[PDB]
Write a protein that binds this DNA or RNA. Structure first.
Ligand SMILES: Cc1cn([C@H]2CC[C@@H](COP(=O)(O)OP(=O)(O)OP(=O)(O)O)O2)c(=O)[nH]c1=O
Ligand SMILES: [Mg+2]
Ligand code: NA
Length: 270
DNA sequence: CAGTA
DNA sequence: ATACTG
């Protein structure tokens, strides 16, 4: 049992799951978070992402008050306009959009507007997420990176000091780049809650649909339906899946097609 | 697969 | 339930 308490302890750190916690206990004799923090630098196996979880342990365990999330929203929207221009927009989802007084992180969607001209390739292929991230890094807002690819960024963002002088904690910031036609389904997914998404996706299954952030897809009967995911690359469904899309313009559209009563974001905590 | 949205 | 990065 000694290593069971250790695992439950060590998995409190961002980037450490049961597997990594066991290795720490067995190969390092480390059994407390406090020891992990004091020793991390002398452990070479740790990845760059685990190192961020350790360095920002204090900040990461503090919740963000709604008033500060409003400031992150305004900041990201302004910087988006400055460096990407009017073709793009930022929307903050997660527990903030569900109107919780506190949130664990900042969940942002970056997407092209309905008015922006259509592209000839997936928007992710333009490198735009990386350009936006570099801009935020030059401003010293983004100060550490956990993971980054062409669709999803996870890092630590800190609002600049405001003038007495107010100094802010670094916060977990997640940015997802989403195609225009996928925005209504991405708003559903990234607003959650987690349990709400599972319930709605189960409802889809029962009616012969696939629901994800990219769309609502009508698969048909259980047999007609029959490797990384259901069939998307760079944020775009493969043609065979795209052909199944039921176009939607609003969250309400999705509730309606699935025969579920509409719920406001603040009522999505089952 | 591990770990996190 | 379904998905992205390492
Ligand atoms: C974990 C998880 C999350 N999601 C969606 C649904 C929510 C958003 C945000 O995730 P968060 O963990 O930040 O959720 P949040 O509700 O924003 O709460 P915090 O206040 O940030 O903890 O992602 C999911 O589909 N499957 C999952 O396993
Ligand atoms: Mg969140
Ligand atoms: Na963890």
């Amino acid at each position: 049992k000694p290593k069971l308490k250790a695992i439950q302890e060590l998995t409190q750190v961002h980037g450490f799951g049961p597997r990594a916690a066991a290795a720490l206990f067995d190969r390092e004799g480390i059994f407390t978070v406090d020891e992990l923090l004091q020793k991390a630098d002398s452990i070479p196996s740790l990845t760059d992402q685990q190192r961020v979880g350790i360095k920002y342990f204090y900040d990461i365990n503090e919740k963000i008050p709604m008033q500060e999330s409003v400031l992150h929203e305004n900041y990201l929207r302004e910087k988006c306009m400055e460096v990407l221009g009017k073709d793009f927009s930022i929307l903050i989802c997660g527990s903030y959009r569900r109107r919780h007084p506190f949130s664990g992180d900042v969940d942002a969607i970056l997407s092209r507007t309905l008015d922006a001209p259509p592209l000839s390739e997936p928007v992710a292929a333009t490198g735009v997420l990386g350009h936006f991230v570099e801009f935020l890094e030059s401003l010293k807002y983004l100060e550490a990176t956990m993971a980054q690819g062409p669709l999803k960024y996870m890092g630590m963002g800190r609002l600049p000091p405001r003038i007495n002088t107010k100094v802010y904690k670094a916060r977990r910031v997640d940015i997802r780049l989403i195609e225009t036609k996928s925005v209504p389904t991405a708003m559903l997914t990234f607003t959650g809650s987690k349990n709400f998404n599972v319930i709605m996706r189960q409802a889809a299954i029962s009616k012969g649909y696939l629901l994800n952030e990219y769309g609502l897809f009508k698969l048909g009967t259980p047999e007609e339906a029959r490797g990384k995911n259901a069939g998307e690359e760079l944020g775009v469904p493969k043609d065979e899946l795209e052909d199944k899309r039921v176009e939607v313009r609003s969250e309400q559209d999705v509730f309606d097609v699935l025969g579920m009563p509409y719920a406001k974001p603040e009522n999505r905590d089952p």
